[PDB]
């Protein structure tokens, strides 16, 4: 009963497996895991030391790697995560 959710974990863990660890982290900063808080890529790239072009670049990258593994989990996901649906 306590501590229990499961809300889901799907599309997290399907993304993660291409993403290497640092890649991962950029992303996990922008999806507000890290602390609990969604903040923009903005804040993840100056926190590090690259522009939106690097999370850019994974988001590229990310989808070469996922045409294997997952259909396109990464699509969806991102997709149902931002304003991109409409109301």
Do not use: C
Not at 12 to 22: C, D, F, I, N, Q
Not at 53 to 69: M, W
């Amino acid at each position: 009963k306590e501590a229990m959710r499961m809300l889901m974990r799907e599309e997290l863990e399907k993304v993660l497996k291409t993403l290497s660890p640092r890649e991962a982290m950029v992303l996990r900063m922008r999806y507000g895991l890290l602390d609990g808080k969604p903040k923009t890529l903005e804040e993840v790239g100056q926190y590090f030391n690259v522009t939106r072009e690097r999370i850019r670049q994974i988001e590229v990258k990310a989808l070469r790697k996922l045409r294997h593994p997952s259909r396109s989990k990464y699509l969806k996901s991102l997709l149902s995560l931002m304003d991109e649906n409409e109301g």
